[PDB]
Amino acid sequence: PMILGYWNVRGLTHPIRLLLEYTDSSYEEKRYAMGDAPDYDRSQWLNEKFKLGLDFPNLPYLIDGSRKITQSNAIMRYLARKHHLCGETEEERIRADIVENQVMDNRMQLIMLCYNPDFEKQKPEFLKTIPEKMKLYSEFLGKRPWFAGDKVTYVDFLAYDILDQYHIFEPKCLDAFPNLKDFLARFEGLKKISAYMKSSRYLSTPIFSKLAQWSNK
């Protein structure tokens, strides 16, 4: 089987776990544990960081037979290509690229708050702008069923994830944008996904390490 490595948290690997399940990939997980405050030990990871044969060691990582990958985005693309979940036309490919990249940007702005020690003072305002990001997703999506075009591609897994996290941080966000509420239910409604979500394997929260200020436990 394949091996997926990451922190025993949701964080930025949600999209990959969803995808392995969607493609019915034969995989195993290694979920590393950090230590508690004050030191939050990383030894479980660090003891083996440099012993797996990875080009640029990091988490998440993926081992598949002789193939070893790091960089969450690269792992996504590799599975996309293996099960043919990419865009078919130049139009689709260009939407996919944009969305891949956008999600990363929004994921990071989030972290950095949820990691910003003034999480609170910063909060009110941060979520002052949560709306406008959401609006960008909505108009991009329009009336299509999937982000890239006619069928499901890798990017929907990425879009699903940040939109889910958003409506966790500001439940009242999804509100003005019904096409975003429907996407989330259509994604949640894919057979293989529905089953995963009720499984023992599923890990929705926490999103960050105990180090965070939100979804840290």
Ligand X SMILES: N[C@@H](CCC(=O)N[C@@H](CSc1ccc([N+](=O)[O-])cc1[N+](=O)[O-])C(=O)NCC(=O)O)C(=O)O
User: Of the listed pieces 66-74, 118-126, 175-183, 184-192, which binds a second copy according to CB under 8 A?
Assistant: 66-74
Which amino acid is residue 145, in one-letter code? P
204 labelled ligand-binding: no
163 vs 169: CA distance, rounded Å: 10
Closest contact distance (angstroms) between CB of 49 and ligand X is 6
Tokens found for residue 191: 């057979």
DSSP 24: T
The answer to whether residues 212 and 114 touch, using CB atoms and an 8 Å cutoff, is yes
Rule CB under 6 A: say whether 98 interacts with ligand X.
Answer: no
Closest distance of CB 113 from ligand X, Å:
12
For residue 194, what are the CA distances in angstroms to 112, 137, 183, 190? 31, 23, 14, 6
Of the candidate residues 30, 42, 77, 186, the single one contacting a second copy (CB under 8 A) = 77
Among 25-33, 73-81, 120-128, 189-197, the segment contacting a second copy (CB under 8 A): 73-81
d(CA 80, CA 76): 6
45 is in an annotated binding site: yes
d(CA 31, CA 48): 13
- Using DSSP bridges, classify how beta strands 27-32 and 2-7 pair: parallel, antiparallel or unpaired: parallel
Of the ranges 55-63, 81-89, 130-138, 175-183, which one interacts with ligand X (CB under 6 A)?
Answer: 55-63
47 is in an annotated binding site: no
- State the binding string over 134-163 for a second copy (x if CB under 8 A, else -): --x--xx-----------------------
Instruction: Please check if 122 is assigned to a binding site.
Output: no
User: Residue 49's binding partner, choosing from a second copy, ligand X, none, with beta-carbon cut-off 5 to 8 A by kind?
Assistant: ligand X
Which tokens in the block code for residue 141? 């999506």
Residue 12 interacts with, from a second copy, ligand X, none (CB under 5-8 Å by kind): ligand X
Q: Residues 69, 61: contact at Cβ < 8 Å?
A: yes
Binding residues (CB under 8 A) for a second copy: these are 55-56, 58, 67, 69-74, 77-78, 81, 90, 93-94, 97-98, 100-102, 105, 136, 139-140
